[PDB]
């Protein structure tokens, strides 16, 4: 029922999901001059060498690549986190044109897209339990700007024509998510929420300072996707981003000076 349009978009979500007006909603604008360098923050540990991708799916709001999360194979640790978080899926948010598409903003700047790698805390045993806890999820967010192609994204781009419409899926084995990461793991962090319904307040956000560059041809393929199902009136899957929400009583911390 929910979506990104005039009649079902972000301004409507609070009716079915009242937490939309909560105290720790995401995304937010990252004011770089107000974010506090925290020398107690540890380097982020990204251990993706044994990742096992399974499927790629158009879920009617984005496309996602899903992973086997039944053992510690692709895990996030360190940084602001206590314990171990397993990679479940990644997906993207993007715009109709290159000047919008990201969910987080940096000094009000919008990037062309944003990659979210979604992880859950192993101490809660499964993701459905983790989303009920304030420290249940860790989402690693990476900005995309348009420039040179990202080689590690091409395998994704080349299969999008097979999942054009909603609920369509394909095999997507042997994909290495290390190929989506920028050089630096410098980050901002704050406590927040899912940016899509149910908007649960369960996420430690880790947003990388360094964007990745993707080519115009790569992002053009994202924009050929459809929100609609097969045979239904065609509506391009574009502008699938929630705008920045009030920071309220939260501090954004920087891992770098
Ligand atoms: N854009 S974002 O990265 O904030 C969304 C993170 C939600 C991921 C989820 B997957 B499916 B639906 C939602 B519920 B259930 B599992 B549970 B985890 B959260
Ligand atoms: Zn997301």
């Amino acid at each position: 029922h929910w979506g990104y349009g005039k009649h079902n978009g972000p301004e409507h979500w609070h009716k079915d999901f009242p937490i939309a007006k909560g105290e720790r909603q995401s995304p937010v604008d990252i004011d770089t001059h107000t974010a506090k360098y925290d020398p107690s923050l540890k380097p982020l540990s990204v251990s993706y060498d044994q990742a096992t991708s399974l499927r790629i799916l158009n879920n009617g709001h984005s496309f996602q690549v899903t992973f086997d999360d039944s053992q510690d194979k692709a895990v996030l640790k360190g940084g602001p986190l206590d314990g171990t978080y397993r990679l479940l899926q990644f997906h993207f948010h993007w715009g109709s044109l290159d000047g919008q598409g990201s969910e987080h903003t940096v000094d009000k700047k919008k990037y062309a897209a944003e990659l979210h790698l979604v992880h859950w805390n192993t101490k809660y045993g499964d993701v459905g339990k983790a989303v009920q806890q304030p420290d249940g999820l860790a989402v690693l967010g990476i900005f995309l700007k348009v420039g040179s192609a990202k080689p590690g994204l091409q395998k994704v781009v080349d299969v999008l024509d097979s999942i054009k419409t909603e609920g369509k899926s394909a095999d997507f084995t042997n994909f290495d998510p290390r190929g989506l990461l920028p050089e630096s793991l410098d980050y901002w962090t704050y406590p927040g929420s899912l940016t899509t319904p149910p908007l649960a307040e369960c996420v430690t956000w880790i947003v990388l300072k360094e964007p990745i560059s993707v080519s115009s041809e790569q992002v053009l393929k994202f924009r050929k996707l459809n929100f609609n199902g097969e045979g239904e009136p065609e509506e391009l899957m574009v502008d699938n981003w929630r705008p920045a929400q009030p920071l309220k009583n939260r501090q954004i911390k920087a891992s770098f000076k």
Side-chain angles (χ1 to χ4, degrees), residues 1-5 7-41 43-76 78-154 156-167 169-220 222-223 225-229 231-250 252-256:
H1 167 253
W2 64 269
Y4 292 93
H7 300 285
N8 68 356
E11 303 311 309
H12 292 271
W13 295 350
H14 73 99
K15 291 176 277 171
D16 271 350
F17 306 96
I19 203 172
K21 296 184 182 302
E23 300 305 307
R24 58 173 281 184
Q25 291 288 292
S26 295
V28 298
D29 183 57
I30 301 165
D31 177 332
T32 64
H33 289 289
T34 303
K36 177 68 175 167
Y37 170 55
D38 184 351
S40 73
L41 283 172
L44 191 64
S45 175
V46 182
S47 299
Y48 287 173
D49 52 300
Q50 293 303 135
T52 298
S53 64
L54 298 174
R55 304 291 293 174
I56 190 168
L57 169 64
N58 179 331
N59 60 31
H61 43 100
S62 183
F63 71 88
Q64 68 182 81
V65 173
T66 57
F67 290 79
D68 179 3
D69 64 346
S70 74
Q71 301 183 79
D72 295 348
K73 287 182 169 194
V75 301
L76 189 65
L81 306 170
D82 294 332
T84 299
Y85 291 67
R86 292 183 186 165
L87 179 64
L88 171 59
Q89 55 105 319
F90 69 76
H91 63 274
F92 299 81
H93 307 265
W94 62 90
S96 48
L97 290 174
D98 297 350
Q100 62 189 33
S102 69
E103 296 207 304
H104 294 89
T105 57
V106 178
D107 297 335
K108 302 299 177 85
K109 180 186 171 71
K110 294 173 168 79
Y111 288 87
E114 189 172 329
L115 165 59
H116 290 161
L117 295 122
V118 182
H119 312 75
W120 57 269
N121 192 330
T122 59
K123 82 194 209 157
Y124 301 123
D126 71 66
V127 68
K129 288 290 190 290
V131 292
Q132 303 178 61
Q133 300 291 340
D135 60 349
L137 277 54
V139 184
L140 181 57
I142 304 177
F143 296 120
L144 281 59
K145 64 185 186 181
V146 176
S148 63
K150 190 70 168 185
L153 185 60
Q154 194 60 31
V156 171
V157 167
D158 280 331
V159 300
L160 294 182
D161 76 300
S162 75
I163 57 157
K164 185 175 173 187
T165 52
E166 171 284 308
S169 67
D171 184 284
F172 203 69
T173 53
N174 302 292
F175 181 78
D176 186 349
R178 294 177 293 187
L180 299 175
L181 306 175
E183 290 178 1
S184 179
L185 295 177
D186 290 351
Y187 64 88
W188 297 284
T189 185
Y190 72 98
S193 74
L194 313 181
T195 71
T196 45
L199 304 170
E201 289 183 338
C202 60
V203 181
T204 302
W205 276 95
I206 300 167
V207 176
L208 300 189
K209 174 175 183 195
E210 186 185 325
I212 64 169
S213 296
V214 302
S215 64
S216 56
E217 294 86 356
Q218 291 180 316
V219 72
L220 179 84
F222 287 15
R223 296 181 183 141
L225 281 169
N226 284 184
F227 283 127
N228 53 281
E232 294 173 359
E234 182 168 353
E235 305 297 349
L236 295 182
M237 184 181 283
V238 294
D239 295 316
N240 61 344
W241 50 276
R242 188 187 194 191
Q245 303 300 307
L247 192 58
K248 297 187 165 173
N249 308 8
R250 293 178 286 177
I252 305 180
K253 296 176 198 165
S255 75
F256 60 93

